[PDB]
Amino acid sequence: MKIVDAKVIVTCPGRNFVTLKIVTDQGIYGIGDATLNGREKSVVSYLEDYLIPVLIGRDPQQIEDIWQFFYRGAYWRRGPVGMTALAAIDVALWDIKAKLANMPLYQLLGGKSRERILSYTHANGKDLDSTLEAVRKAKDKGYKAIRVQCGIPGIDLPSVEVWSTEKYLNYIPDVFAAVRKEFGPDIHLLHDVHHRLTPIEAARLGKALEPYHLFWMEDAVPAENQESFKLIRQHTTTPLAVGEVFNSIHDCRELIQNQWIDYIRTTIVHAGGISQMRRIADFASLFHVRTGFHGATDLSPVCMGAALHFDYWVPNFGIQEHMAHSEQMNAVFPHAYTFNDGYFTPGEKPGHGVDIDEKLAAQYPYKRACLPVNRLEDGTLWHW
Template sequence: MEIIDYELFEVPPRWVFLKLETDTGLVGWGEPIVEGHARTTITAVEEIIDNYLLGKDPLEIERHWQAMYRGRHFRGGPILMSSMAGVDQALWDIKGKHYGAPVYDLLGGRARDRILTYQWIGGDTPEEMREAAETAVNNGYTTLKMAANSQIRRIDSPEVVEEITNRLAGVRDEVGNNINIAVDFRGRVTKGMAKWVASKLDPYDPMFYEEPVLPEHFDVLPRIESHTKTPLASGERLYSRWEFQQTLANSQVDIIQPDPSHAGGITEVKKIADAAEAADIAVALHCALGPIAFASCLHIAVATPNAFVQSQNLDIHDHNQNDLLAYLLDPGVFGFENGYVDAPDAPGLGIDIDESFVREQADTQFDWQNPIWYHDDGSIAEW
């Protein structure tokens, strides 16, 4: 069996799908994308496949991963690792279909039956946040995630810290103490403010603080940790086991969040998760993308003992009225129930892509870019 062809589809809202074809008729799907850099990522995928993968046996995944990573002088970074990630996902999809097994069986089998998932809640005011939280809980979620703040200056005022505190306080008051609430700092808070904000939010018992500072400032995490009782999480902007090495060795966080569409795919993320288990660090795989990326996460999560919660950006509680799941022939394949989801048990990634819908959406004209934020003085704010 060999790889003979491929296609890439840029589709709304901000995703790229890869279709990898073999001479036996088996097809694998992956999701290689860096949000806001779709065209750059597509070009990188084309270079990988055109210059290396065509004509190769898709079953030799580890060999291909090593060749894609080590075969060029320059390596790593979000574009190259995300491009590799989508190719790797498609190879696992083909391999599972070839052997008639779901990917999680090829990763060693189930460590659990299902995985807890959380719902993102948004809003510009505490009242809007409360309403979003109420809706999520009514839809069956027992775990929520929210942004701590939007714009924040390098050193900000007590008023701003109070506004941040009120957002979490309102959600906690709305849902009570039997609901977990993760709080995402999104790397927007400087190290000078992070310990202040964390200590003010602590009384409302967050599940964890995500990206309390950007990865380039991980050296200050022990100082932040000394000001809070809440577990610290990060890792969506780390792209390989080597970038996670110091974080794991020094126990800089309690939870790592590698993304299988950014950190080298299923092959690499499973290795990162296994290394975290040895360090007694939990795993909450990051996924702000589409159904192929989400399926990849679920197969890793159910085969990983130290995974404990799975992010998602698909609003999967209502798959019958969800256009984000319209890319699947069976939108109910993830089996959402009582805040949990299942890994699809069909061969490969276990999802059937509605290719006609993909092609239809790929014909639409769009170019997703995140907004650029400015502070009142005209300087650039972290988005």
């Protein structure tokens, strides 16, 4: 068996998505997500100008050899751009392998471990009354788990947000108190701190949120120095999640082996595909850590299909984020996965069950969109 062609498709049906398609000499093809929000074209070049020319002629069944060849062979290791490119290749090859086996991908990984996959959605409001309404709307859509974000009183190219830590820490516990009073204890509640605190501030916030029994408090502090979480863990029993921005097991080995976190959020598209995320999830399982894949709209339906197959098998599954794609996004990527009453199943189609409609994708050209930056009230460039 040989790879005869590989191509990168770029489309913007509401937001930018980048997709790799690998075609074999037997006409079976596979696809993988390569989208890196706000830096998309750097991955397109990494693939087109460097990795795709090496793929041609190789045996697509050698998933591990090709993963190692690109991971080690880049010489400069890890990193968002190269690991997203490698993820796209790895997912497309697992898609091919499952189609050659005539099995849905979850069967190749070890089969199903559960009948349904818990998800969570968003509830965002500019103030408390609107936040409470957004939680009602999320519950009415059948979600059993809801991430709550609320505006704080007094608070093509990157937008610039302004931030006050002190105002946020003083107000946000009152939001969770009000949500618990209105909606009761059974609903799972999540909160994303979005990198804005120092560890002793995160320790304070985790303690203040303990009475509300959150499913997790996410991304509390920037995590390049993984020891940052030791101080948080010493002060609170609010569960901790981190890692949507990671691209390697080396970004989280210490967080996990020291039991400093409860959920690892690192994704298939951003951390080298199914081959690497199997290793992260298995390492996590030794230390009570569960998967909580990031699932914002900037991960394409191809990533979602691969993630749901992974979620259906992995023993230490925690939850799957679901920020829904629009109708126009979904039409470009026909898929077998489905949602019902707060939960997903991956679908029984062979492969990860996702395809790309190339004719439709071609109707929507790339349009640049970058992520915001965040400044403190004095103008300091902070963490967004």
